[PDB]
Amino acid sequence: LTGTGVLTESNKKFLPFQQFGRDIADTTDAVRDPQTLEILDITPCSFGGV
Amino acid sequence: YFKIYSKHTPINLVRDLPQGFSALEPLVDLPIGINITRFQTLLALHRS
């Protein structure tokens, strides 16, 4: 699973089976890292109009 | 793939299915790859 964003700590109580998370657009918003099983939130890098 | 979903609920109702809602979490996924059209419930006898 590929993408770009800032990985931050999260407070989303994922259930054991649950691995990743998806928004309305279906783009991944959170992911569970292998090897360490922790839950990383994926926040898109800052952008806007010039 | 044999998908088993499970949910365990403490109840105190006597005879029938309780009326309510409980979403079943996935328990196990088994790669059995076999044809299934018939099934059996397994019970346990009590002897004295």
Ligand SMILES: *[C@@H]1O[C@H](CO)[C@@H](O)[C@H](O)[C@H]1NC(C)=O
């Ligand atoms: C390797 O990944 C597994 C999960 O697939 C995990 O249980 C285990 O702790 C990991 N080992 C190390 C050394 O990170």
